[PDB]
Each structure stands twice: as structure tokens, then as C-alpha cells.
Amino acid sequence: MMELHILEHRVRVLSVARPGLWLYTHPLIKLLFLPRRSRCKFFSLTETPEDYTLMVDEEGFKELPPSEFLQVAEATWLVLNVSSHTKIARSVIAPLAEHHVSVLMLSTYQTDFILVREQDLSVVIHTLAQEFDIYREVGGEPVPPIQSPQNRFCVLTLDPETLPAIATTLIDVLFYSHSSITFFAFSLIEGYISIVMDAETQKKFPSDLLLTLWRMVRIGGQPGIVAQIAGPLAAADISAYYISTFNFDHALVPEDGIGSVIEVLQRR
Amino acid sequence: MELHILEHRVRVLSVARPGLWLYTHPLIKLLFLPRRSRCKFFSLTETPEDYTLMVDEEGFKELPPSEFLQVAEATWLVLNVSSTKIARSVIAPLAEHHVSVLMLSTYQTDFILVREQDLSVVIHTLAQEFDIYREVGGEPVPVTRVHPIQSPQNRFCVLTLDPETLPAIATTLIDVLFYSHSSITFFAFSLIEGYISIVMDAETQKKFPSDLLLTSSSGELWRMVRIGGQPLGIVAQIAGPLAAADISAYYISTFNFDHALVPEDGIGSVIEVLQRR
């Protein structure tokens, strides 16, 4: 009935250490603000107290030199999106984890992306052929146990042609700003802009540009958990935004029920 | 008729093009974030040879070593005449006393950079025609103690800009400076004491938003004369000749060449005077 689409993007996952981020000001800026200079179509940038986790297609990957501040996940990743015409947890990540496949969840303002190794593509088609109808984009056509800080997050989108109006204030946040977690998310994917940022980080930005109450739960290890969270929250389903970084996995649920989401996440 | 010595202590260096990316992070801070730098004198000039950077000591502390970097060993002071014919009354005599100078004409004022080594001589040479002041505690205090010419055909514009609208052009400006690629490629941006001066091409002027860059009655645009040379190791031979014709010009010195910008409809009359000498 429903549909699960596999998209063209060939994503690479990087971890740029914080003290090294500046060595990549030139590349990342090209990917952030200058559409007409990089053919990249999938750009995800996340800031966490451990590092800056990046996800970029192969075309946006040839512009990031290797270095000591930069550790790359040696796997290539494909993108999955559910459509019809968020019950995603129990229908995508529980069958996935049951066969011990790891998934990187990246929910955005527009859609939710499930990232999988390409070596594990053979299983997602078989463990799932009968829950959805699986499509694959050929061209532009579809052919068949840890912490939570007190930060209050906003998930905002942005008209692409207004990105310059914030460029500076955005650059300032990422390359020059050094509970109470520092967390930031910016993703330009297929020309769609999504950002997660706390409340007084939005105070930095002008008033009415950021077009549109959340809160963070968090857990993961260095270098399966996303399924634990996803299944613990699908039980008595609530809304959530899942973002996977190099080390941790994050979920953003509304404030009004944060406590409940910590009761279900801790018993499991 | 006043001569002011400003408190700026400027360093002058050259960034080779292959390495400009390595300085995107510091440069951007100096260009767009006037709070995370105590620098208040900043100038960046793109020529075909290299990028030239004139930056005070605070902004100089923001730049890391590199093989693409060539820093002039000397510290420089900035001179300014108060109430662009600085030639016949400053550059000419100082040149007669064998004092090299680095010009930096901006939309707001014309800066004359001299090494502190030469400072004394400068006073010795100009105390008779100007009352020389020095900026102590932010206050102007009276002090008692063989070269061919290149004439590109680009049409340059001299623009200033309201600082409170600089972000609106940021993405464009960055694109022009860090990610781009008879004529020559020449681009000037300077922020000094909160004033922005940009020299641009008209082909480069199309890429920017509308109704932000401000020009001085420029229906007539500008043309460049450019006398070449090697690294920091000659404006007298452009300023003084050009002084005879009482014609005004924007002077800009870079690490390897010297540039004068004259109104366009007189460019020929300028080149004439320049090849006599």
C-alpha cells in the first residue's frame, strides 16, 4: 500500500573535529551558500559537543581534503523516504534492526530520511518488500541509556532565496561560536533547507526569516540504538525528529511531554 | 593642510592564490564580524599576481603561518591629510628623501603608509608645510619630537557601502573573493575605522544586489594605470608626473605592483604623461 523510495544520493559520513572545523571553512561555505558552484544535492551538517558530523554526496565529498581532524565512515550510504498517495519507527527501523542493520536517521522539516549502508541494500528489499511498495529513483522518476539536556529546540525551514540574508549570522554560529548542550543542524537537501537550533540561538537571527517547540533525548556510542529509541516511542506513539550523528543518536519530542518520552526510553 | 599620523600599526603581506582557502576563516572574520576581532584597519586587494593584505597588529594575530604567505618584515604607519593631490606636497618630497610609500586611496580618504623607520624623516621633510599631528589616546596631539606601463581596459567603479547593509552582499562578496576562477582581474575591499571602500569591475558589479553599492556621481567610470615590479624590496614615478596635469586619481599599492585609477574620459591624456617620464 504505502511506498518506500530509494533515492539517487550516495552519501558519505564524516566527523570533523571541532578545533579543525576552520580548515574546512572554504569547502563547507561553498556547499552552504553557493548553489552554483557545487553539484552536491545532499548536504547535512550537525554540530555536537563531540565534533561536527557531515553527510555529503560523492560530488560534495571531493571538496573536503583528508586531515587529522577528519575521520570518514568507510561505508557508502543510500537514502530512503516513505510516502503514500510518523509511523516510520515500527515499520522501517524495527524490521531493519531485527536483522542487525544499522540505520542513520535524519529527519528534516520537509521529510524524514533513513540512511542505510549500500552493502545492506540486499536485505532492506527482502525484509520489507511486503510492508510497502519499494521504488527507486532512476533519473527523476520512481521505478519499482544516556543523557537529555534542558535545551529548547526549534525546527525551522527557510526560503532558499532568503539564505543570503542570514549567511553572516549563520556563518558566525558554525565557525566562530565556541545539561546545556551545544547542538546545531543545517541541511540543504534537494534545494530544501532545514535547521534545528535552540531558542536563544534563534535570538541571534533576524525576526521573521526563519519560517516554521521541541526537546532533546540522546544516546549512542563511538564510531541499533536508534531502533531502541524508535520502538520505545512508537509504543504509545508520539511525534519525534530523529537525527543520527557520528557518535550519538538524537530525538526531538515536544516539550509538553518530554517527561513521558524519558519514561518510555528508560524502561526499554 | 594638517598631517595626521594615525594609531594604526599595519602589517603588509601577500597570500599566493593556491592558498587563499587556508585563510577563508580568518579573512571572513575581518570582513564581516567586527566583534570577534579588535582589528580596525583591514585591506584586501586581488591582483593576478597574488592577494595583498594590509592589517593592523590585532588582525595580524589572526593569521597563521603558511608557505603561501609572504610577510613584510616592517611595521607601517598610516598618514592622512586633513583640513587627492597628496603627490606634489607629500609623495614627491618624501621620495626626494628616498622614503618608499604604500598608497591606499579609499572612497573616504587617501592613506599614505610609511615605515616607522622612515617616520622621523617624514616629519623632518614635511613639518614645514603641514602641522603634523599624532594619534595618541585616540586624540590628535601636535608633535614636536626604467619601468613599463600597463593600461588594462577594464572599467572600474569606486563604491562605498553602508556598513549596516554589508551582510546583504556577503554571499556575493565571498563568492567574488574565494571561489571565482586585454584586461586584468582586480578587486579591492577595505574596512578601516568602520568605513568600507571597494574597487570593482563593472562586469563584477553586475553580480551584486541592486541599490546597495554607492558610487560618487560616476556616470564616467574609472580606468586603471598600473606600473609593475617585484616583491617589496615607485608611486613617485606615477603621482608626480600625474601631478603636473592637476588630474586626480585613486592610488592603490599592492605587494608587487602600483595602481592609479583616473576618470575614464581622460585615460589617454594620462598615459601620455606617463610614458614621457
Do residues A110 and A156 make contact, with C-beta atoms less than 8 angstroms apart? no
How far is residue A111's CA from residue A106's CA, in Å, rounded to a whole number?
A: 9
* Whole-angstrom Cα Rg for chain B: 18
Contacts of A72 (CB under 8 A, 6+ apart): A12, A13, A14, A15, A66
If phi > 0 it is left, if psi is from -120 to 50 it is alpha, else beta; for residue B207 that is: alpha
Question: Is A26 within 8 Å of B24 when comparing Cβ atoms?
Answer: yes
Q: Where are the alpha helices (DSSP H) in B160-264?
A: 167-178, 202-205, 236-244
Nearest to A150 by CA among A197, A202, A233, A216: A216
Contacts of B211 (CB under 8 A, 6+ apart): none
How many CB atoms are closer than 10 A to CB B78? Answer: 23
CA distance A164 to chain B (A): 6
Q: Which helix (H) or strand (E) holds A57?
A: strand A51-57
Grid coordinates 531558542 are at which residue? A199
Residues annotated within the binding site of B for L-arginine are 100-101, 233-235, 254-258
A267's grid cell: 524502561
How far is residue B126's CA from residue B93's CA, in Å, rounded to a whole number?
A: 8
Residues listed for chain B: 277
Nearest to A159 by CA among A192, A186, A185, A205: A192
Do residues A248 and A215 make contact, with C-beta atoms less than 8 angstroms apart? no
The annotation status of A102 as a binding-site residue, yes or no, is yes
Question: Is A164 within 8 Å of B175 when comparing Cβ atoms?
Answer: no
Torsions phi, psi for B256 (to 5 deg): -125, -30
A172 CB within 8 Å of a chain B CB = yes
How far is residue B107's CA from residue B198's CA, in Å, rounded to a whole number?
A: 8
Nearest to A216 by CA among A189, A185, A194, A188: A185
- Chain-centroid distance, C-alpha A253: 15
Torsions phi, psi for B190 (to 5 deg): -145, 135
B124's grid cell: 623632518
What's A147's DSSP letter? -
Label residue A242 exposed, middle or buried (CB < 10 Å: 0-12, 13-18, 19+): buried
Can you tell me whether residue B142 is helix, strand or coil? Answer: strand
> Which chain B positions have a beta carbon within 8 Å of A164's beta carbon?
167-168, 170-172
Which CA distances in Å does A207 have to A163, A198, B177?
Answer: 14, 15, 29
Q: Which helix (H) or strand (E) holds B94?
A: helix B92-96
Mutate to test the interface with B, among A21, A22, A170 (most CBs of B within 10 A): A22
Fold of A3-143: VC0802-like (3.30.2130)
How far is residue B44's CA from residue B189's CA, in Å, rounded to a whole number?
A: 5
Q: Which helix (H) or strand (E) holds A71?
A: strand A70-72
Question: Closest residue of A to B175, CA-based?
Answer: A34
Q: Which residue ranges make up each domain of chain B? A: 2-142, 149-276
B174 CB within 8 Å of a chain A CB = yes
CA distance A24 to chain B (A): 8
Torsions phi, psi for B235 (to 5 deg): -55, -25
Which CA distances in Å does B69 have to A24, A101, B94, B179, B252?
Answer: 19, 49, 29, 19, 20
A178 CB within 8 Å of a chain B CB = no
How far is residue B217's CA from residue A1's CA, in Å, rounded to a whole number?
A: 68
Mutate to test the interface with A, among B22, B23, B28 (most CBs of A within 10 A): B28
CA distance A148 to chain B (A): 31
Residue ranges with strand state E in chain B: 2-15, 41-46, 51-56, 69-71, 76-82, 102-105, 110-115, 131-136, 139-142, 149-150, 156-161, 187-192, 195-201, 214-215, 222-227, 250-253, 258-263
Question: Is B179 within 8 Å of A22 when comparing Cβ atoms?
Answer: no
A163 CB within 8 Å of a chain B CB = yes
How far is residue A7's CA from residue A13's CA, in Å, rounded to a whole number?
A: 17
Resolution in A: 2.8
B207 CB within 8 Å of a chain A CB = no
Question: Is A176 within 8 Å of B29 when comparing Cβ atoms?
Answer: yes
Which CA distances in Å does B192 have to B118, B160, B197, B261?
Answer: 23, 12, 8, 20
Contacts of B15 (CB under 8 A, 6+ apart): B23, B50, B51, B52, B53, B66, B68, B69
Exposure string of B109-137, with b = 16+ CB inside 10 Å and e = fewer, is bbbbbbbeebbeebbebbeeebebbbbee
Do residues A112 and A103 make contact, with C-beta atoms less than 8 angstroms apart? no
A159's grid cell: 526560503
What CATH superfamily classification does B149-276 receive?
Answer: VC0802-like (3.30.2130.10)
Equal CATH topology for B2-142 and B149-276 = yes
Which CA distances in Å does A13 have to A46, A52, A115, A246?
Answer: 11, 11, 10, 7
Which CA distances in Å does B68 have to A53, B29, B163, B230?
Answer: 29, 20, 30, 16
Grid coordinates 606601463 are at which residue? B149
CA distance A19 to chain B (A): 12
A209 CB within 8 Å of a chain B CB = no
How far is residue B178's CA from residue A85's CA, in Å, rounded to a whole number?
A: 45
Exposure string of A183-206, with b = 16+ CB inside 10 Å and e = fewer, is bbbbbbbeeebbbbbbeebbeebe
How far is residue B213's CA from residue B107's CA, in Å, rounded to a whole number?
A: 12
How far is residue B112's CA from residue B19's CA, in Å, rounded to a whole number?
A: 28
Do residues B112 and B80 make contact, with C-beta atoms less than 8 angstroms apart? yes
How far is residue B42's CA from residue B31's CA, in Å, rounded to a whole number?
A: 8
How far is residue A77's CA from residue A10's CA, in Å, rounded to a whole number?
A: 6
CB-nearest partner of B168 from A34, A37, A164: A164
How far is residue A212's CA from residue A110's CA, in Å, rounded to a whole number?
A: 11
CATH class label, B2-142: alpha beta
